[PDB]
Design a binder for this molecule. Structure first.
Ligand SMILES: Nc1nc(Nc2ccccc2)sc1C(=O)c1cccc(C(F)(F)F)c1
Length: 282
């Protein structure tokens, strides 16, 4: 490339290939994302203004030769790989707590600036050797607008609601919190209906009592099986009551009842939060 030198492919992103690259002029190592619309350019460019310790910095938006690339700060490893690497022993609770606290700070910051992620998953949560965790790709979904992982999708999205709210990110984070704890995905659906029914089998089929307006959602069907809610103590067993109470508030069916990132930061679960050093194999 004219302005960069590719080091290697990191993986397949939602919008195109993501490469580890080196800036020709500065020598800095970055995550270069090729995007496979003028409104998009202006919108994404606004995201360069976001700066928070728990948000992966969008360094630049490059539009040349009629191709679009996004330049992001490069982090050491993603949470998916770290969880896989920590499968035999599990991520220590203090580190799970630290990561959840930091992720909520990142969401609180973005949400306060009216920016949603909409597709949070372990793959876009990045960590470093110092104990920090950061979220990448906030705001891209709104700007770009559409195998895909459905495991972290909020129910309102699965039911076809075309209006998103900050609550979709809290749902995804709750799913990730559960996965760090149990070392297994909470709702590993293989299709949209399987994803929805896995949520229903665990949290109970929603109704107008727990979620006013659910029966009028676009893809809701009166024929959905009616499953009873499972005892929450069976869903993420290890986790103590503070952790379980917080998780339950992040997984409420009605997005309006779901706890905000700001309110979650004040939950008793974080009374003893610390910032441990992770054991990272790079
Ligand atoms: N900034 C940034 N640093 C990264 N370092 C890294 C280095 C080694 C292993 C894993 C991640 S990855 C990354 C992403 O922003 C990102 C987000 C979603 C998906 C992907 C991909 F999977 F590669 F398509 C990448």
């Amino acid at each position: 490339m004219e302005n960069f030198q590719k080091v290697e492919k990191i993986g397949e992103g939602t919008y195109g290939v993501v490469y580890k690259a080196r800036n020709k002029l500065t020598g800095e190592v970055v995550a270069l994302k090729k995007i496979r619309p003028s409104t998009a350019i202006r919108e994404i460019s606004l995201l360069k203004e976001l700066n928070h310790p728990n948000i992966v910095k969008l360094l630049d938006v490059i539009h040349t030769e009629n191709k679009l690339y996004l330049v992001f700060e490069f982090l050491h490893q993603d949470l998916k790989k770290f969880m896989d690497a920590s499968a035999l022993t599990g991520i220590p609770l203090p580190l799970i707590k630290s990561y959840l606290f930091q992720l909520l700070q990142g969401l609180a910051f973005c949400h306060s600036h009216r920016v949603l992620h909409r597709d949070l998953k372990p793959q876009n949560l990045l960590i470093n050797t110092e104990g920090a965790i950061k979220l990448a790709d906030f705001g891209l979904a709104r700007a770009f607008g559409v195998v895909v992982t459905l495991w972290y999708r909020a129910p309102e999205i699965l039911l076809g609601c075309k209006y998103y709210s900050t609550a979709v990110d809290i749902w995804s984070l709750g799913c990730i919190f559960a996965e760090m704890v149990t070392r297994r995905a909470l709702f590993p659906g293989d299709s949209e209906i399987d994803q929805l029914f896995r949520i229903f089998r665990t949290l109970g089929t929603p109704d107008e009592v727990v979620w006013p307006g659910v029966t009028s959602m676009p893809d809701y069907k009166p024929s959905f099986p009616k499953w009873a809610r499972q005892d929450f103590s069976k869903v993420v067993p290890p986790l103590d009551e503070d952790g379980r109470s917080l998780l339950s508030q992040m997984l409420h069916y009605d997005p309006n009842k779901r706890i905000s990132a700001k309110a979650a930061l004040a939950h008793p679960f974080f009374q003893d939060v610390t910032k441990p050093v992770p054991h990272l194999r790079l």
